[PDB]
Design an enzyme around this catalytic site. Structure first.
Site, PDB file in Angstrom:
ATOM      1  N   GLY A 188       1.017  -1.300  -0.078  1.00 36.03           N
ATOM      2  CA  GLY A 188      -0.125  -0.009  -0.090  1.00 36.03           C
ATOM      3  C   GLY A 188       0.912   1.204  -0.084  1.00 36.03           C
ATOM      4  N   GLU A 189       0.122   2.398   0.368  1.00 43.28           N
ATOM      5  CA  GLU A 189       0.760   3.614   0.587  1.00 43.28           C
ATOM      6  C   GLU A 189       1.634   3.740   1.869  1.00 43.28           C
ATOM      7  N   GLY A 233       2.715   1.275   3.609  1.00 47.68           N
ATOM      8  CA  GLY A 233       3.618   0.440   3.837  1.00 47.68           C
ATOM      9  C   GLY A 233       3.226  -1.065   3.395  1.00 47.68           C
ATOM     10  N   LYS A 271       6.109 -19.716  10.305  1.00 47.82           N
ATOM     11  CA  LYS A 271       5.741 -18.707   9.162  1.00 47.82           C
ATOM     12  C   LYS A 271       4.866 -17.557   9.812  1.00 47.82           C
ATOM     13  CE  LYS A 271       3.650 -18.408   4.729  1.00 47.82           C
ATOM     14  NZ  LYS A 271       2.804 -19.063   3.798  1.00 47.82           N
ATOM     15  N   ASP A 283     -10.219   1.591  13.111  1.00 46.85           N
ATOM     16  CA  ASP A 283     -10.682   1.324  11.946  1.00 46.85           C
ATOM     17  C   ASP A 283     -11.125   0.010  11.941  1.00 46.85           C
ATOM     18  OD1 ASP A 283     -10.025   1.666   9.050  1.00 46.85           O
ATOM     19  OD2 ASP A 283      -8.227   0.700   8.914  1.00 46.85           O
ATOM     20  N   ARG A 337     -12.451  -5.989   6.250  1.00 48.42           N
ATOM     21  CA  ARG A 337     -11.223  -6.153   5.603  1.00 48.42           C
ATOM     22  C   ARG A 337     -10.303  -6.316   6.734  1.00 48.42           C
ATOM     23  NH1 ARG A 337     -13.128  -0.684   4.739  1.00 48.42           N
ATOM     24  NH2 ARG A 337     -12.055   0.609   6.082  1.00 48.42           N
ATOM     25  N   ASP A 371      -5.397  -4.690  12.919  1.00 48.87           N
ATOM     26  CA  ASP A 371      -4.937  -3.184  12.239  1.00 48.87           C
ATOM     27  C   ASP A 371      -5.591  -2.159  13.261  1.00 48.87           C
ATOM     28  OD1 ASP A 371      -3.729  -2.259   9.865  1.00 48.87           O
ATOM     29  OD2 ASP A 371      -5.322  -0.950  10.126  1.00 48.87           O
TER      30      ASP A 371
HETATM   31  C1  LIG Z   1      -6.217 -10.131  -0.036  1.00 56.65           C
HETATM   32  N1  LIG Z   1      -5.988  -9.459   1.385  1.00 56.65           N
HETATM   33  C2  LIG Z   1      -5.038  -8.872   1.532  1.00 56.65           C
HETATM   34  O1  LIG Z   1      -4.285  -8.348   0.330  1.00 56.65           O
HETATM   35  C3  LIG Z   1      -4.448  -8.045   2.898  1.00 56.65           C
HETATM   36  S1  LIG Z   1      -5.499  -7.616   3.827  1.00 56.65           S
HETATM   37  C4  LIG Z   1      -4.473  -7.002   4.991  1.00 56.65           C
HETATM   38  N2  LIG Z   1      -4.742  -6.629   6.235  1.00 56.65           N
HETATM   39  C5  LIG Z   1      -6.048  -6.383   6.874  1.00 56.65           C
HETATM   40  C6  LIG Z   1      -5.644  -5.602   8.107  1.00 56.65           C
HETATM   41  C7  LIG Z   1      -4.222  -4.760   7.058  1.00 56.65           C
HETATM   42  C8  LIG Z   1      -3.703  -6.160   7.379  1.00 56.65           C
HETATM   43  C9  LIG Z   1      -2.303  -6.445   7.249  1.00 56.65           C
HETATM   44  N3  LIG Z   1      -1.779  -7.955   7.276  1.00 56.65           N
HETATM   45  C10 LIG Z   1      -1.669  -8.257   8.374  1.00 56.65           C
HETATM   46  O2  LIG Z   1      -2.019  -7.899   9.893  1.00 56.65           O
HETATM   47  C11 LIG Z   1      -1.575 -10.045   8.521  1.00 56.65           C
HETATM   48  C12 LIG Z   1      -1.390 -10.772   9.563  1.00 56.65           C
HETATM   49  N4  LIG Z   1      -1.356 -12.008   9.204  1.00 56.65           N
HETATM   50  C13 LIG Z   1      -1.484 -12.168   8.053  1.00 56.65           C
HETATM   51  N5  LIG Z   1      -1.657 -13.368   7.415  1.00 56.65           N
HETATM   52  C14 LIG Z   1      -1.598 -13.313   6.142  1.00 56.65           C
HETATM   53  C15 LIG Z   1      -1.908 -12.249   5.442  1.00 56.65           C
HETATM   54 CL1  LIG Z   1      -2.372 -12.079   3.750  1.00 56.65          CL
HETATM   55  C16 LIG Z   1      -2.063 -10.862   6.156  1.00 56.65           C
HETATM   56  C17 LIG Z   1      -1.564 -10.874   7.504  1.00 56.65           C
HETATM   57  C18 LIG Z   1      -4.526  -6.587   8.550  1.00 56.65           C
HETATM   58  N6  LIG Z   1      -3.076  -7.374   4.746  1.00 56.65           N
HETATM   59  C19 LIG Z   1      -3.241  -8.114   3.454  1.00 56.65           C
HETATM   60  C20 LIG Z   1      -2.144  -8.371   2.872  1.00 56.65           C
HETATM   61  F1  LIG Z   1      -0.938  -8.809   3.415  1.00 56.65           F
HETATM   62  F2  LIG Z   1      -1.986  -9.287   1.659  1.00 56.65           F
HETATM   63  F3  LIG Z   1      -1.444  -7.441   2.249  1.00 56.65           F
END
Ligand SMILES: CNC(=O)c1sc(N2C[C@H]3C[C@]2(CNC(=O)c2c[nH]c4ncc(Cl)cc24)C3)nc1C(F)(F)F
Length: 269
Positions: free
Chosen positions: A29-30, A32, A48, A150, A154, A168
């Site tokens: 994203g913007e 990070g 992991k 927030d 999502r 988040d």
């Molecule tokens: C299709 N989904 C997406 O694109 C999303 S939604 C999302 N987030 C929602 C909120 C902001 C946050 C960031 N990530 C995490 O805090 C995770 C902790 N553990 C995880 N394990 C897996 C993943 Cl994919 C993410 C996390 C929580 N992050 C992705 C990502 F990572 F793909 F960029």
């Protein structure tokens, strides 16, 4: 003493950079990026993980992380720790370490359930169970007087055992008083929770179809609220509607909502 308790929390939250290996970018994203990673644990084995990358602001990030790491609830995402790496430009790059969720975010899961190769059609009973899980996480945070700010589908993650956890901690999620006078309370998170329950019940629809983000304050001010979804019990709709009562004091607490959602769930065969 409050100070010594904060000093402990700070010692506990930092992870040595040598214990972490960074992998592929999962999202960017913007504000990070999110990358896959490996964390070397105390038991000598690697786990992991998901790694999110973003003096006063650094200390503020650390202090906030120290608080979140202390949270301990199955419906609240666990913060495993933080690393502070420095960019080539001498700009601090704080990293936050979280468990890796193979099922991803709740919003994407919901949308995938409407596609053939995605998860099967989610039953009403399971959609309600997701709502109970988020209410439990929010009840935990509100009891600790910690504001999410927030809350949306999502920002909710699905664990491997299908448990939902809040993570988040967006005009269509913001309460009528926060749009009018910047005022943000636990009752403002209750409003976002109502909006989140509606997203779950519509299986991922964007709130207020046909209403533009700039028309939102006027729309709410005139008494309009999210419409009842087609596949939604009247009892559930009343619960999500109670989240959007004009006066924040009239809105139920997360504890009250949780109990109403649990009772409705138990009432289903
Ligand atoms: C299709 N989904 C997406 O694109 C999303 S939604 C999302 N987030 C929602 C909120 C902001 C946050 C960031 N990530 C995490 O805090 C995770 C902790 N553990 C995880 N394990 C897996 C993943 Cl994919 C993410 C996390 C929580 N992050 C992705 C990502 F990572 F793909 F960029």
């Amino acid at each position: 003493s409050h100070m010594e308790e904060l000093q402990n929390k700070l010692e506990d939250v930092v992870i040595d950079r040598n214990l972490l290996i960074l992998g592929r970018i999962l999202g960017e994203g913007e504000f990070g990026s999110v990358m896959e990673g490996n964390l070397k644990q105390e038991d000598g084995t690697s786990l992991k993980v998901a790694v999110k990358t973003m003096q006063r602001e650094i200390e503020e990030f650390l202090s906030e992380a120290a608080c979140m790491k202390d949270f301990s609830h199955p419906n609240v995402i666990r913060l495993l720790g933080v690393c502070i790496e420095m960019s080539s430009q001498g700009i601090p790059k704080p990293m936050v370490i979280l468990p890796f969720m193979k099922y991803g975010d709740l919003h994407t899961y919901l949308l995938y359930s409407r596609l053939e190769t995605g998860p099967r059609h989610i039953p009403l009973q399971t959609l309600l169970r997701f709502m109970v899980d988020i209410a439990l996480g929010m009840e935990y945070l509100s009891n600790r007087n910690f504001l999410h700010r927030d809350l949306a589908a999502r920002n909710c993650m699905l664990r491997d055992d299908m448990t939902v956890c809040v993570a988040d901690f967006p005009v269509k999620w913001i309460a009528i008083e926060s749009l009018a006078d910047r005022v943000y309370t636990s009752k403002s998170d209750v409003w976002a929770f109502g909006v989140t329950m509606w997203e779950i019940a519509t299986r991922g629809m964007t709130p207020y179809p046909g209403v533009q983000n700039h028309e939102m304050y006027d729309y709410l001010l005139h008494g309009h609220r999210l419409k009842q979804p087609e596949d939604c019990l009247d009892e559930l709709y009343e619960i999500m509607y109670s989240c959007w009562r004009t006066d924040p004091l009239d809105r139920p607490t997360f504890s009250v909502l949780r109990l109403q959602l649990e009772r409705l769930l138990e009432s289903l065969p």
